[PDB]
Amino acid sequence: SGFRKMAFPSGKVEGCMVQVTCGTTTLNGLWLDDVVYCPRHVICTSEDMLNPNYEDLLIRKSNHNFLVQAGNVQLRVIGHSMQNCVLKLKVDTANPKTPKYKFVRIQPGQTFSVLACYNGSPSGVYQCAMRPNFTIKGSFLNGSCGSVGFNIDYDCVSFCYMHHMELPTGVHAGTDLEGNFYGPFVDRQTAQAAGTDTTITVNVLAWLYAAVINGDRWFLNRFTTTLNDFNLVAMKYNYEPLTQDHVDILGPLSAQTGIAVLDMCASLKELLQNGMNGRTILGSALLEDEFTPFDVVRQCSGVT
């Protein structure tokens, strides 16, 4: 029992982190097979960020201008190309620690672990979610660029995020490993404001199920609702609309606890309207939305 914001074991990803320097800019790279992936803004000076023309700045760079260091040994760069907002640096040595891997583009509401790195060295691991406005609420300082987000399914690492930017509001933006930003963000030091950070309803419901499984049951009420009535309340509270697809995804948790999905929706509706009244759920005074239904099943079943 007990429920924690848990990240995947980071060992498989630590074995991939390298340092990439181009001139005076140093950031993190991800070394998989004989390719090192990193944010293309490694070629920019702080002045270039204001209005960068990446294709033009890249013309002034050669293979020998990209310095890749794995641990404390230099890797030989034999090719370089830009794919969207990432650079792929072909090196002459395949990463001996390359795990089985995939590149995936996640949907808002999906969670992943981040291995925050500086100078190609890991500093920490934490769990976060792709917000409905396509930002992530991470913990990243200058030099954290190129740190990656991932999920693990047994022995296969699915990389889903590479860190690129911090918005003026302290929220973060990045790309998938094909270099495509999540949301409308661009790798330029310009005014970019985030949209509404709505609450991930299906994740809140999954966490209410985790609370029941772990003995926190005070919030269970004697009511039920419908998807339409629930969604009227959810919209008013800036929660994402709940669909029949989400109800289907919650099926296993509904079966485990014997609490119908719509009954849990009615409990969540009363929590939204009445508040917590100074009480806590799984040690939190707010409704947690960065656990997916899959994360709840995984943590409560002990998948390794």
Active site residues: 41, 145
Q: Which does 90 bind (CB under 5 to 8 A by kind): a copy of itself, ligand Q0I, none?
A: none
Say which residues have a Cβ less than 8 Å from residue 146's Cβ, sequence separation at least 6: 20, 27, 28, 29, 30, 37, 38, 39, 42, 117, 162, 163
Name the segment binding ligand Q0I (CB under 6 A); options: 100-108, 160-168, 227-235, 262-270: 160-168
- The least CB distance from residue 301 to a copy of itself, in Å, is 8
Angle at which helices 201-213 and 293-301 cross, to 10°: 20
Q: Helix (H, G, I), strand (E, B), or coil: what is residue 209? A: helix
Tell me how far apart the alpha carbons of residues 144 and 122 are, in angstroms, rounded to a whole number.
10
Decide the pairing of beta strands 100-103 and 156-166. Answer: parallel
Q: Is the dihedral of CA 41, 45, 47, 53 positive or negative?
A: negative
Q: Build a one-symbol-per-residue string for 181-210: x at contacts with ligand Q0I by CB under 6 A, - elsewhere.
A: ------xxx---------------------
- The least CB distance from residue 81 to a copy of itself, in Å, is 29
Q: Which is nearer to a copy of itself, 58 or 125 (CB)?
A: 125
Question: Per rule CB under 6 A, is residue 287 in the interface with ligand Q0I?
Answer: no
Closest CA to 61 of 20, 23, 108, 113: 23
Tell me how far apart the alpha carbons of residues 219 and 216 are, in angstroms, rounded to a whole number.
8
Question: Per rule CB under 6 A, is residue 30 in the interface with ligand Q0I?
Answer: no
Q: Which does 27 bind (CB under 5 to 8 A by kind): ligand Q0I, a copy of itself, none?
A: ligand Q0I
Q: Give me the DSSP letters along 257-286.
A: HT--HHHHHHHHHHHHHH--TT--BTTBSS
- The least CB distance from residue 291 to ligand Q0I, in Å, is 19
In angstroms, the Cα distances linking 15 to 37, 71, 302 are: 14, 9, 24
Q: Which is nearer to ligand Q0I, 1 or 304 (CB)?
A: 1
Q: Which residue's C-beta sits nearest to ligand Q0I?
A: 145
Question: Per rule CB under 6 A, is residue 214 in the interface with ligand Q0I?
Answer: no
Question: Per rule CB under 6 A, is residue 121 in the interface with ligand Q0I?
Answer: no
Q: Which does 165 bind (CB under 5 to 8 A by kind): a copy of itself, ligand Q0I, none?
A: ligand Q0I
- The least CB distance from residue 157 to a copy of itself, in Å, is 13
Question: Per rule CB under 6 A, is residue 276 in the interface with ligand Q0I?
Answer: no
Q: Which does 147 bind (CB under 5 to 8 A by kind): a copy of itself, ligand Q0I, none?
A: none
Question: Per rule CB under 6 A, is residue 82 in the interface with ligand Q0I?
Answer: no
Say which residues have a Cβ less than 8 Å from residue 285's Cβ, sequence separation at least 6: 276, 278, 279
Q: Which does 189 bind (CB under 5 to 8 A by kind): ligand Q0I, a copy of itself, none?
A: ligand Q0I
- For ligand Q0I, the binding residues (CB under 6 A) are 1, 27, 41, 49, 140-145, 164-166, 187-189
